């Protein structure tokens, strides 16, 4: 009505206040919107797209070589091929993924991850890797025997070129992360005139139950 009192918060500019302001050009008609393919209304859709993990993020490795996990014929048995933590937020292989980049724009996230492994050796190459997941409680397994006792997958190259690993739950707050280890279950076996070295490409993504809390500017740029 006509009687009025001005309360505290009068004449303040709060940068997060979603108020209304008068249009600068009233009766201006913007260009009508045509259909454009590929509209996205959520960053979780981008989090759910598989992107390459930079697992070979070692000193001296440059360029596309950092995206390849080397697999070769081993003199020793039951050796560890590669390990990485399933931690989208912190520095490491997940920095190269879309979910890893989006998590740095937020403070807290939780949900299930998805890791896919792609074997890119010859059609004639065969063998087994043991892919083991260790929950955030424990440290890295010391032997293939120890890794076989926890959550693991035995992966055969000659049958399946790709396997999906699902990490049941990770979380972060203002890391509590598991570890993925790849073991040489068998020797790398090839016929004659076949390369004895191959690569594994690791991809990472978020599941349908991943979420983000408290938007926070990134420290990458």
């Amino acid at each position: 009505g006509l009687p009025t009192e001005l309360k505290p918060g009068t004449n303040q500019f709060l940068t997060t206040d979603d108020g209304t302001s008068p249009p600068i050009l009233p009766g201006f008609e913007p260009t009508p919107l045509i259909h454009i393919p590929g509209e996205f209304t959520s960053l979780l859709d981008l989090c759910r797209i598989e992107t390459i993990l930079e697992v070979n993020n070692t000193t001296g490795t440059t360029g596309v070589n950092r995206l390849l996990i080397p697999v070769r014929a081993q003199n020793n048995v039951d050796q560890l091929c590669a390990s990485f933590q399933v931690d989208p937020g912190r520095n490491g292989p997940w920095q190269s993924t879309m979910v890893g980049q989006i998590c740095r724009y937020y403070t807290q996230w939780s949900g299930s991850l998805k890791v896919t492994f792609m074997f890119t050796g010859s059609f004639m190459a065969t063998g087994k890797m043991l892919i083991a997941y260790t929950p955030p409680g424990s440290a890295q397994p010391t032997t293939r025997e120890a890794a076989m006792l926890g959550t693991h997958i035995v992966w055969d190259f000659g049958l399946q070129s790709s396997v999906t690993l699902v990490i049941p739950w990770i979380s972060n707050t203002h890391y509590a992360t598991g570890i993925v280890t790849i073991w040489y279950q068998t020797n790398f076996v090839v016929p004659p005139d076949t390369p004895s070295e191959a690569n594994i490409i690791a991809l990472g993504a978020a599941q349908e139950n991943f979420t983000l809390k408290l938007c926070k500017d990134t420290d990458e740029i």
Partner: protein, 221 residues
């Protein structure tokens, strides 16, 4: 310890991601010493700072309304009763050449008259592109490479409404809030340092996306 529940989906939306009023320019209206201009012309640049440029370049096409807030004061934070004119110069309109040029009196250039002692002026600029969306990436030639003139949003010419020099510099902090944002065609986040303001140019010294570690088998950095 561990976030047992989910954080919801509201803050992962594109609308929330590109929201909140953010500093897009610090405009100085110099009136003293060697610089007695008494006015400034500021081109509206949504990508003035790298933090906002990287967030916007997650999209290819983007349609939104912009709300601008001008936070103005003197060098010593004082806000006396000085009268200021905030003129919006629409794309393809002449810009002021001096403190008392005739473009300050053009009726088709909307103006805000506000005092420094008033709460900050606020106004909404609509979607301005001749196309259905703003193009952060245009792969072609106007008739330099990649320089689309459809992303011109206009100019904010700011002056003190005064006859001769006042001897006082006015600092104007321009805050912009993106409204009703629609984004098309997700893109990878920029991983290289920006070299120039309008190009994807990067230095030959290429930085690795992921931080280095000692070996592919160790989990300590």
């Amino acid at each position: 310890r561990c976030v047992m529940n989910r954080n919801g989906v509201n803050e992962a939306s594109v609308e929330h991601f590109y929201s909140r009023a953010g500093l897009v320019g610090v405009v100085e209206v110099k009136d003293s010493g060697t610089s007695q201009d008494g006015y400034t012309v500021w081109p509206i640049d949504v990508m003035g700072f790298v933090q906002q440029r990287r967030k916007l370049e997650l999209s290819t096409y983007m349609r939104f309304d912009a709300e601008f807030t001008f936070v103005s004061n003197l060098n010593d934070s004082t806000t006396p009763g000085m009268l200021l004119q905030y003129m919006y110069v629409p794309p393809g309109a002449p810009k002021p050449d001096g403190r008392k040029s005739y473009q300050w009196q053009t009726a088709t250039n909307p103006s805000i008259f506000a005092k420094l002692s008033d709460p900050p002026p606020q106004v909404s600029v609509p979607f301005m592109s001749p196309a259905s969306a703003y193009q952060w990436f245009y792969d072609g030639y106007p008739t330099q490479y990649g320089q689309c003139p459809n992303n011109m949003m206009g100019h904010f010419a700011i002056r003190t409404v005064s006859e001769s020099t006042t001897g006082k510099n006015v600092h104007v902090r321009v805050y912009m809030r993106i409204k009703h944002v629609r984004a098309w065609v997700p893109r990878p986040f920029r991983s290289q340092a920006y070299m120039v303001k309008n190009y994807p140019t990067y230095s030959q010294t290429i930085s690795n996306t992921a931080a280095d570690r000692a070996s592919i088998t160790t989990t300590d950095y």
